[model samples]
Target: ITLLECVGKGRYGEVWRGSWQGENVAVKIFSSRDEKSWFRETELYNTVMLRHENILGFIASDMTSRHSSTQLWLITHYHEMGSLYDYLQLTTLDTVSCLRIVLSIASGLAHLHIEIFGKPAIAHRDLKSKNILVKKNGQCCIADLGLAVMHSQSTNQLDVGNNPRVGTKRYMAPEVLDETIQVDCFDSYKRVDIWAFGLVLWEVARRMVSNGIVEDYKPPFYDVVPNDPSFEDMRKVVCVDQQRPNIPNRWFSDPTLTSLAKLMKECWYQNPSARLTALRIKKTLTKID
Candidate 1:
């Protein structure tokens, strides 16, 4: 692949719009300090049964030498619409589009969390709107597997890749905030994902138009936390104060929003064990029609 143009920049490294076989692709060039993220995402893409319509399509992983250090690259299919976070900022969703976005996200999460015969179960430790891409077909695909965890039932082993990455504090679950999550248990990681999923659902629901009422896009906890909340700031609101994003009264006036409100609430339970599984969320979404 040849880098054509730089598209974005993040703490990890630069993202380039590259050309491969006359097709456009996204090339993520990892900095030396964030090489572990590249390795983890590459390993995840190589896993058996990892490909799905709702998950980012991986093309290649390459390591080339620079003058003084090694440069890592991960190439994947490109989407012009960008992340769900960016897409929601300028657009409002109709009922069908809203369901499509949330349901597609739930489907991708379910695929990752489900264990197949030859594949280990996986958990997305950093699932949020920014890590999800919006497709032209109005569906969403899960991206950024750097902080994922895998579980092998045959060996009874948990492989949390050796990345010093932590989840976004804004989306962290109550157990995570309190540092009481059972790190050894795979379900603990899945529950953390469920918590984040609830926040994403809220973000989507707020953008759904109903009865001439559509809320402006806002990040979860925009009303309570500072611009860059600390771990302690999140813990105080989510644990000590037991606060959740407010469900607008307008939601109850619309059947679709009412159903979504109920579903999101089920995912946001303070007790991690009581949260809905990804599969359950997908199944509920199908019934919401």
Candidate 2:
């Protein structure tokens, strides 16, 4: 019903808790100064309403005019559990719980990929734990499709070098660091998501370990620290350096971790065409016998 305090802030927007329609909801408000975000959200959600079980359902949108700026309100289901990133740090998950969370995400991604109302492929360019929501049932849903692009019908492209890329640096794909290459390709964006998925899977597996995943949080090739690295640094280390996430020997002992490690490697392959499809990811998760 009313906007509360700011829950969090990011590069493009901020999230605020709101009371709406007699339920708690999270309202993501795009920086009013950025006029483009207002248009993008309307177009993106208009094409598709909430359908995926593992994706946060959209409730409504409202435009508010304040004294100095215009606010675009995106109301969606509020998960008291918050993001997967926050959850991981607090506790460890049993094998069953881990699979449930990861598989739910695969299901959500599949929904976005499949045709919508006879439309084209919908790909989420950015997929990270911070963008994953944990439901009360201990399952997870993929959130933040702001960087998504439709493959079949429209002409949406991201500038390679000139434009500031809109994703977490640690999770960026090799191609993302190569400015000379094309960024507008749909396959390219999907590959980026795959790479990020691999890192997230790694995080999940490490959380099952005895010591937990503080160090594994720094995926391979990530600058010694967790800070955002430049494209140049990424290209030199991730692309030309031919580096991929490191799976410790300890992981090999756990069959579940080993399986996830192998799958993640396939996702991190330099060749985008060879990357596993979202459908394939779902199939793989289902087959974890």
Candidate 3:
């Protein structure tokens, strides 16, 4: 397919809507600055069988040098609804809608975390609402595995490429902010993802309708951190201060929202190991009604 229109833009690159065979696909064209992300993400996808409905479908990875400009293209199924970050800002959710969205995310994370015979455990090092795309079916898919870490129990090897970049500071866990995370332990990375997932849950829950009241969209730690929070800014709030995203008092009025509040709190525990597993979250969400 050929590029049609620029759908989204960031320092990393531009996402374009491409038309191919009467169907639309999302094209992520990497810039020179974020080439490493494209390279590592491509290499990992090339070797892993990460195919799942809740996981963004990878179609093709190609490179083109046109008129002295070389660009990397990663193509995938297009979701017109855009990122969860954008969707939450515009839409308020009912109980079932909210449960479906968060449950879809939990299922996706569980699929990535669980390692069966031929598959290996994977950790999405960057788990945030912005990195999750909303589908027209009212569900969401996890995206941007650029900084993912995979581990195999058969070999006990962590396949973390030499990429040095970390995720957004606002979602950093207490252990990550304190620099006390066991970098060599695969479980440490999983717990880190759970921490961020908890924050995303908070973001979505706040937008859920309860007693005809829903909060305006707000990013995690919006009240505690600055617009562009520094590492020290996050470290102090998450580690030294041992703080977490606040659960609104009004959430207690709704059963689902109240349960979700408790779930997110478990995810934000100061002890990394105390966080809920992705599978546990999925199962718990299944019965939250």
Candidate 4:
């Protein structure tokens, strides 16, 4: 109930640092246009419970109307370090430290994509560095479930694009940019996540200190597209131009970064079917030194 600083603000509404029983929590207050997101996540948690260390921890989803208008709040465990994007900008990372963050993220995605005994497999429709937070430990945690999709083995399908939310244009896979993604196929969504994962991999790899050199933090497609690119802007570059993020020459000299470069290449194949699965990615990452 005690709201502190406004940590984030945008279409996602204002996220604030709040306290409950003297414990800090991150509060994501959804905007009016994005009201359905609140209940969507609620439905996912209620139906298919998730309790993964790498995934963001959910505390509560509450609505209040004390300010005359309604306020939709989704509260979760807070991280003082903020997102991986912010952390990268703050400083560079060593090889082992870098591996821990990426591996933790891969572990979480693998858990979400794999089906267990009672729960169904899920796809994080939106997966980007901004949605990932750096915890106190070297490990990182994924943000939320608002834009996530689930596939039930019993039903053999999932709820198709019923929600208004769409994937980020900058991170759009070639199939997504060209409108060739098979909406009915669950694997298509996983492929899309893999494509974005490649970009995120590139983002983190650049900041890893290799041979006493590191790159400045820049979003994927920063070299080709404008700061805030549109659908047409991304469609042309991703599908029409068939371009992927650039790998620096320095990566070749470092064995760790060289391995990472190869791993990321497998993720951005123009053909979605050729893209590696989350399980494959996680397995390869585990082997990476």
Best by TM-score: 1
Clashes of each: 0, 2, 0, 0
| lDDT ranking, high to low | 1, 3, 4, 2
Candidate 2 ranges beyond 4 A from true positions: 66-68, 117-119, 153-165, 180-184, 210-226
Local accuracy of candidate 2 as per-residue lDDT tens digits, 1-289: 7888788897668888888778899988887554455555455667654456798777877788869767777888999888998888777776788888888888888777776545457767778888899999988888866667666644442322222336666677877777443656767666777877877888787676533432334344554433566656666777777877677777776777778888888888887778888889889989984
In candidate 2, what residue range of length 10 has the lowest lDDT sum?
156-165
Count of backbone collisions within predicted model 3? 0
**Local accuracy of candidate 4 as per-residue lDDT tens digits, 1-289:** 7999999899878889998899999988999888777777776666435778898888888877875798888988999899998999978999999999999999999988888876678888889998899999899988767877889887786865357877888988888778878988888888899999889999999999987899999999999998799988999898888888999999999999999999999999898889899999999999999
Better of 1 and 4 by lDDT: 1
lDDT of 2: 0.73
Question: Candidate 4, clashing residue pairs?
Answer: none
TM-score per candidate: 0.97, 0.86, 0.96, 0.96
Residues 141-164 of candidate 1 have per-residue lDDT tens digits of 999998999998888889988998
Candidate 3 structure quality by residue, lDDT tens digits, 52-113: 87999998998888798888989999999999999999899999999999999999999999
Model 1 lDDT, residue 18, Cα: 89
Candidate 4 error regions (>4 Å) = 65-68
